[PDB]
């Protein structure tokens, strides 16, 4: 059981676990910060698969077995038109 929550600037909070496609969590001993990478399914061709937008510099929280392991800021965002 892994849950991902996102806090947006206006005050809205979303649970996006049903949309996530892949998750990665890592760290190294020569840097002070850990990193989290994830992907969601969003299609512009199909109206059904349009989702919410998550702007840069919004907080994301990562839970495993009802325990919070990661809290951080969103830094990069990318969208490919083919996929």
């Amino acid at each position: 059981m892994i849950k991902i929550w996102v806090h947006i600037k206006n005050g809205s909070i979303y649970d996006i676990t049903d949309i996530v496609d892949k998750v990665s969590w890592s760290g190294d001993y020569k840097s002070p910060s850990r990193t989290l990478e994830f992907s969601i399914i969003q299609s512009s061709f199909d109206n059904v698969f349009q989702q919410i937008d998550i702007p840069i510099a919004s907080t994301v929280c990562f839970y495993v077995d009802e325990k919070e392991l990661f809290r951080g800021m969103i830094i990069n965002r990318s969208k490919d038109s083919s996929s």
Binding site: K30, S31, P32, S33, T35, I75, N76
Partner: peptide
């Protein structure tokens, strides 16, 4: 063109690591 894609990925990784801070 493979070298260009590899270089692009390496540059992106290095920039992310620079932002994160390296000892």
């Amino acid at each position: 063109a493979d070298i260009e894609k590899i270089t692009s990925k390496l540059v992106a990784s290095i920039q992310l690591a620079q932002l994160g801070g390296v000892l």
